[PDB]
Amino acid sequence: QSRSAKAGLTFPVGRVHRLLRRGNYAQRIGSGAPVYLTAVLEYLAAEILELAGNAARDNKKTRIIPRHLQLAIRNDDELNKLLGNVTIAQGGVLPNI
Amino acid sequence: TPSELALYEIRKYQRSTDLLISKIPFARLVKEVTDEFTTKDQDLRWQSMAIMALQEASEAYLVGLLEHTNLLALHAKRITIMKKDMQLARRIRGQFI
Amino acid sequence: SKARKETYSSYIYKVLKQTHPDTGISQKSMSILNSFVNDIFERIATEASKLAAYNKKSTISAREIQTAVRLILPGELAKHAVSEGTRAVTKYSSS
Amino acid sequence: DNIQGITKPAIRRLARRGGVKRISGLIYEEVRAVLKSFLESVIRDSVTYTEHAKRKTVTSLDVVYALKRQGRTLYGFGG
């Protein structure tokens, strides 16, 4: 039985645990830290992916392109503050008005 | 002569390197600030070293911001500074986002 | 012998089908999401390691990760983040 | 009304140190606002730091770490 199914998440937990172990971060790694980090990452990914999907559906398009990702990122103050120095490849710029 | 007095004051305040803001009002302000950050039943106490370090950091930041505002005002072919110059300097700086 | 690459495409596709059953995704968008989640994981891990070393401790626990995600993410996002983290950890410890 | 503790002569002396010759009547409000914002951010970070360690006294180390994490390293108090 995988720990991901017991925790009710979707992202893997064993891989994150192995990374935290062999990532040269600390001598000992707790048990509740990998599941916590996995849940946080899954929540962030689901949020940004729902935003990108809404932005893509706004343009009556099925596929998701980096332009939709840029439009979804630059339209949220929280994501703009979190991602303020990163650049998206082929994402373009926001219109003036 | 107002220009002579202004230049003399500029030289005198650039030669000095002491504190420029009072300690008791700054301490009361930072206490009122940290009051509404935590909960109500418990509070926190501050030390003199942390308070003076925060005061020096804030003084340096405000001096830098005022210098940038003065440069922006000089760019517009004028001596008197305005709030628009400070707002534009803060916008071009790109911090807090 | 061609080695295997460790990516997160399967889980991203799973959560996409869970959120939008009809909307697809390209390859560049998948790479962008993978790089984003990797950068977020690296930032959180580095912050937690530094904050644990600050307190002369050699053990990273849920409290360090919680403080790290509260410091890195803004308050509005950190609230839901720590809420989901507490829910997940209590669901795991329940069994 | 603690934000009124920053008097006008203090802002005038700060502008003189910065090199400003003439100051208008709307600079003090923006200066107080940006000072309050910077103080709020730094104090929030410091309270988070001192609350993780289940303590009740904010030390200079927490403020130094909060200033360093935000990209403004301070020398002369620790580290």
């Binding site: 949020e47 729902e50 949220d76 103050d77 | - | - | -």
Partner: peptide
């Protein structure tokens, strides 16, 4: 089948010192 529940507003201009209210 899953939707977000957090508040989402337009990006604010910090240089003008806006309020959320």
């Amino acid at each position: 089948l899953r939707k977000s529940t957090r508040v989402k507003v337009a990006p604010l201009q910090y240089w003008r010192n806006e309020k959320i209210v």
